[PDB]
Design a protein around this ligand. Structure first.
Ligand SMILES: Cc1cc2nc3c(=O)[nH]c(=O)nc-3n(C[C@H](O)[C@H](O)[C@H](O)COP(=O)(O)O)c2cc1C
Ligand SMILES: Cc1cc2nc3c(=O)[nH]c(=O)nc-3n(C[C@H](O)[C@H](O)[C@H](O)COP(=O)(O)O)c2cc1C
Ligand SMILES: COc1ccccc1CCc1c(C(=O)O)[nH]c(=O)[nH]c1=O
Ligand SMILES: COc1ccccc1CCc1c(C(=O)O)[nH]c(=O)[nH]c1=O
Lengths: 313, 313
């Protein structure tokens, strides 16, 4: 019985990894993720220049999940490119590098310089499209014309297989349109579903106050709130993009939740809120828990059940 | 100490009512809601002709909420219009009728017939701007030009104050656009935020199956999963639509949850999943709980805290 996978010309001990943003901003964080039992890691979504992000408090967690308006804090592209080129030990596990430029030109600038390190070292690009562009316009992946432009320019600039981090969608027409945009780009080899459920609002009853400072308390939701949303997106893109991989992200706290993601179509399974809350020991727990469900069911490998969710009649 | 309020030229014993679709389809259901302690009731969204809806199972509930793809089952507009005009006891509480025609023309035809009953009896119109999926196009409230058409045509055809049931939005630009549409229409006097979080997917681990039959298991989410989404929409439209009332719906299981909705800006507070699961007894509990939290805080009226959620400076 085993959790091994072989995809994107890399070998993974198990499907688990951090979600971009969690335990991945500093060298210390990336060393910690590398030392963990995860099957891979992704570095913090970066911009060309370092960012301090938004004022605190900017993340808060609760029994059913988390809310954040971090402001994209990160150490800048050059730091994560150096980590990929010179510091990461690729004998331990594969590395993804997430980029999240605030314009198409910023993305292009970065991926031009990532390319030779991807080619030589095998770091894998995740492009965040659940990202602001022009204020007053929707985020990139909710603006299909912008999304197409970003994908065309990054495809041309980078020229190697990459993946994309998607926001959740809520309307069948959007699933259809979004997947058709993605399927225009052969270099998009994996699709990570999902980024946060956007612009939720947590209010504390005792204090009568919102719980984060930026955006008058509005921020993106993760955790137990979003697992059925996550599963729907994984399965919608799994069905619509038969020549791509889907990676699942949202609401994973247990091996059971991972099993559901995988039944929906997930290859890799990313862990955000739960990892932020529990720390990197979560990965040995998730592995044990998933193996125990597999043993009970008689499944020996992940491919035996991946995408095999049953529908009714 | 009592929770009685006046809105829309009606008096309400308390801000609670059912959410459209729950406990409101049949004459029996409407009589049960009328006999309850709720401050108001709303009828099942209707079409011009009766509908069977989708195959069963089409609703399921879980500790964190519910999923549904009912398919707009309803007894038809003539039945609900007769209920409003002949059967409802207005001395007990106000009645809202929800309309959800499958085209603008169908909505116009229903509202032209409702108008004189509204004038004579004081029934209130809630226009549902959510739709079965049509391939190649989004739900009406996610297509802003379609929404503007619907509202223009209904406003002209009806000519009296009405409200609109909205799906959740997840993007700040979308809140700005949606609210600007709604503010073009002076007759839209209340906005109900929110309908279900669209097209989630619940999967059962043991059976490895989806839990509802229609739409390959996809359906709208309610209950605990959606409370921060609901609060965000309530507050976003409360801030954007100062000349309208906002009715909150989503995630209410307790008086504290109602208190959060009202802090965010809600005038009435609708109860869907929790009502389906607990039954109409829930209304007495919710009242008791809300009054208890008001007493502990020193609030004597709802106006004292409605929309007064605090932000961090
Ligand atoms: C503190 C925090 C920071 C985040 N930063 C990013 C980011 O920089 N890039 C990105 O793609 N997603 C980011 N996300 C989103 C997560 O990658 C993930 O998509 C989301 O939290 C849902 O997964 P979960 O339910 O496991 O939390 C962040 C999430 C959190 C909680
Ligand atoms: C079984 C069921 C049927 C529903 N039917 C409708 C409907 O006919 N019209 C409508 O406006 N909303 C309908 N809804 C949505 C609810 O009114 C409500 O917006 C949603 O369930 C979120 O509230 P909750 O978290 O309290 O469940 C339905 C919900 C359920 C669970
Ligand atoms: C400036 O970057 C923003 C701002 C608001 C919302 C989302 C982003 C992109 C970065 C990001 C953030 C973030 O830094 O707020 N949080 C997430 O949950 N996911 C993300 O992808
Ligand atoms: C989201 O509304 C839909 C979805 C599919 C088919 C019909 C509708 C409108 C009626 C409705 C339904 C429904 O009858 O399925 N369920 C909801 O949660 N909200 C509704 O407003």
């Amino acid at each position: 019985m085993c959790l091994k996978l072989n995809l994107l010309d890399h070998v993974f001990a198990n499907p688990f990894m951090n979600a971009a943003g969690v335990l991945c901003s500093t060298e210390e964080d990336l060393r910690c993720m590398t030392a963990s039992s995860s099957g891979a890691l992704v570095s913090k979504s970066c911009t060309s220049a370092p960012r301090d992000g938004n004022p605190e408090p900017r993340y808060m967690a609760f029994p059913l999940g988390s809310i954040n308006s971090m402001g994209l804090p990160n150490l800048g592209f050059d730091f994560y490119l150096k980590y990929a080129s010179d510091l990461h030990d690729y004998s331990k596990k594969p590395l993804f590098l997430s980029i999240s430029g605030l314009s198409v030109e910023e993305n292009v600038a970065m991926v031009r310089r990532l390319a030779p390190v991807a080619q030589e070292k095998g770091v894998l690009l995740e492009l965040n499209l659940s990202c602001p562009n022009v204020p007053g316009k929707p985020q990139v992946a909710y603006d299909f014309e912008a999304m197409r432009t970003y994908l065309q320019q990054v495809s041309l600039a980078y020229g190697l297989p990459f993946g994309v981090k998607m926001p959740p969608y809520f309307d069948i027409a959007h699933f259809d349109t979004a997947a058709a945009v993605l399927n225009e780009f052969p270099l998009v080899k994996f699709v990570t579903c999902v980024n946060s459920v956007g612009n939720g609002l947590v209010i504390d009853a005792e204090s009568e106050s919102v719980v984060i400072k930026p955006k008058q308390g509005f921020g993106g939701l993760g955790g137990k709130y979003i697992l059925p949303t996550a599963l729907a997106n994984v399965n919608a893109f799994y069905r619509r993009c038969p020549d791509k991989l889907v990676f699942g992200c949202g609401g994973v706290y247990s091996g059971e939740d991972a099993f559901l993601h995988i039944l929906a179509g997930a290859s890799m399974v990313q862990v955000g809120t739960a990892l932020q809350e529990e720390g990197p020991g979560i990965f040995t727990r998730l592995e044990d828990e998933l193996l125990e469900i597999m043993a009970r069911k008689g499944y020996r490998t992940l491919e035996e059940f991946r995408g095999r969710v049953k529908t009714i009649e």
